[PDB]
Amino acid sequence: LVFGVARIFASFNDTFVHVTDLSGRETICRVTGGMKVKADRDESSPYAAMLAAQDVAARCKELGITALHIKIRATGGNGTKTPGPGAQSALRALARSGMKIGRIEDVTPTPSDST
Amino acid sequence: PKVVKKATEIKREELAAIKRREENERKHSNKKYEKRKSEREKAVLVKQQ
Amino acid sequence: EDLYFLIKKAVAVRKHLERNRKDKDSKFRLILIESRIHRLARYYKTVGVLPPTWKYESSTASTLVA
Amino acid sequence: IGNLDLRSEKQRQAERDLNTALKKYLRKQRKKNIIDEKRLKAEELYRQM
């Protein structure tokens, strides 16, 4: 079981399913939400997150890591500090297609004082 | 009448507060190892001839 | 003396105010303490314990710390 | 009509004067799952037993 670290940037406009190694430096495979949906309205949707998570899990099972540590974030500076629908739907599809999940953490950038 | 009823409610509140203050001072002071003095005995301050 | 301690507090306030120069709360307390000094000084003039030509503006502060 | 309310009389006197079951206790209180410091004391008692 080779643990890869999946950054899921779930905003309200698009979701980013991103898979890196344990370092954070070397991106293995990323599929954004809007490259699976023709409509910019429905770019941030549970269907978009499901398609992105299926493609990412397929690539990472072709590479043979079959285990992820998932770090979920959102727009946190002056944003909302809550993930969009992409987080729940991508984690659901990601563990529904293989991918024994390891450690889940919501690493949102929380400002001590922004404005 | 309303004045007598309101003032006896106030008197009940004040007497319950005084009893609670005395009971707390008894439970947390050195008076705990004594017999409770009855109220009819507390009615008289001193008697002299 | 009450007047002596009041003018001592006044020189201390004015020296801190000269070193800092930016704050306003010390200036307001200086205005309060100089009004207090002048009122107590006027009562001591109308009693007569001190010279009626004795005055404190800043030179008496300077010549009583000096 | 006129007999004692025994529960109310016991509560009145209370407010005036003021190894086989302790396993099914934990069996009934592991299901809540409120931790409830009396259960912490019961866990320490079961560890001693």
Added chain:
Amino acid sequence: KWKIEPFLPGPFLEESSFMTLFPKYRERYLKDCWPLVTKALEKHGIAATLDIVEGSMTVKTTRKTYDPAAILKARDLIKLLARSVPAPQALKILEDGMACDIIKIRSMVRNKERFVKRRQRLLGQNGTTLKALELLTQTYILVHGNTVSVMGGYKGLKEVRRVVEDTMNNIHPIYLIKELMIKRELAKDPALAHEDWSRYL
């Protein structure tokens, strides 16, 4: 494209667990509203314990939990239960299309009496503007001290975010409710489906 299916069917290696801390006045209400919470979280597969001694709600993923987003649902649920949302609403976050949000509004007004006036202006006369916002945005809004806790769909989360910031920035919520009613009337007919609607507000 937007609907979400319930999870039909061990996806967890490290046994995840989350905690939140509550005070005593919430400890009473949580102690006598807890069996509803642990019943629904047992239906989702997650063990939920409450600690009145330290004052801590814990969730933890059991052996037989299958939904992996259930731990995020449970973490948000115990966050709202600590932040004194009532218990059926906190359990209503466990549906698929709901999400919560906390809006920090104390940073938006320098003054204090002006902040109190604008917060009560957000709350409205007899709560009518607040429940009008809840109706027009399909949300649950709770004006919580210095924060505002909202729940609902993500569209409603965005609209109540805009309305709460504009209410704190001295635009009136009655004006914003009129704006939202105009937007609802325009989105009713799709003959005007893609124009710039700024000519109407």
Added chain:
Amino acid sequence: NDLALQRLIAESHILSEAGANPSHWQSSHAATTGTNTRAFATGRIAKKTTDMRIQALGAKESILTQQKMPMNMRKGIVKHQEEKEKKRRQEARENGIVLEREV
């Protein structure tokens, strides 16, 4: 000046206690309560809103309220309503929730 804005603000209590907000817990309970899943619930809400509209137009008394009660029913009803509002005010003074100010 605006009419339907004034109607939406006043009747929001009745609509959001009837059925119209499925993310609110009281409305999601009252959407399955039974007196709103019955056959003509929308018409009964329409009668309540029309009564409130004539009250806003200037009627001093209502059509929907009952006028004669045996004094123990009305005292129990008014006392229970006042104790409920007082308990909500106290449980909102604790937890720091701010509420609508009304005497």
Added chain:
Amino acid sequence: TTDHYLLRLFAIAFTKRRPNQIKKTTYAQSSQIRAIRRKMVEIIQREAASCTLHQLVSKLIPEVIGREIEKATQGIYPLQNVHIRKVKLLKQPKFDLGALMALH
């Protein structure tokens, strides 16, 4: 540390609610908070200036520092839990494979 690594230690410490109490707020006074912070920085300096980095990590793992802060601050105001929330290594001036392989 004694191996000339500069590092920052960020400690957090929450106030102990005493059992058998009735008052809801366990507020320490501000002067009492300043005394607690003074004893906290004194403890972490006196018990992190003497050891090397490997012994410092071996003391950080079972949280000996937070335990000793909890033990020594309870005469000023009892603290519910003391943790060290961050360690940041700023500069490491040496690359030595001898000690770096004596680790592994």
Added chain:
RNA sequence: GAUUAAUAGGGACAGUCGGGGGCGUCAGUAUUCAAUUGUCAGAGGUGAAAUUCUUGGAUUUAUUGAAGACUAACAACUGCGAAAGCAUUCGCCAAGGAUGUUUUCAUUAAUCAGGAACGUAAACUAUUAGGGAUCGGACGGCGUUUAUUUUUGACCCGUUCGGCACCUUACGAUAGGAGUAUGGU
């Protein structure tokens, strides 16, 4: 030759108290900008879009550096300042409040004409008589924890001054619009 020492003053000392003020210093993230890598097709907004940035690689991932801002959560039916206002640590500088004292001059005082210092908004509105909370002293103590035992502090309780606010009671008080017509301009 010089009164009560005021349940009005001003001052002194002691332990203090405060997100009161000034100057320096220390941090914390977040944002922007730049650099180094892994990138490899969109990203961004919106109810939808569009302007814009995008194979010289945008958005993203990681690590540093700079700049400016602000001080989350704690954070209150609280604290401080006369007011606007005041929340990172530490140091310095004066000032202020209350308490206690086995502290002093003994009317110094109260009020404001004149004058003097500090400075995008609005939009639903002599006691009351105590009680429950609250914080700042001072005193007292059956006791739990510091405490290896004395300090001392935390918790509980009582007394006493002082102050922000709650509720009850008052002790009382008191301060033209809308329609419909008709005739002119």
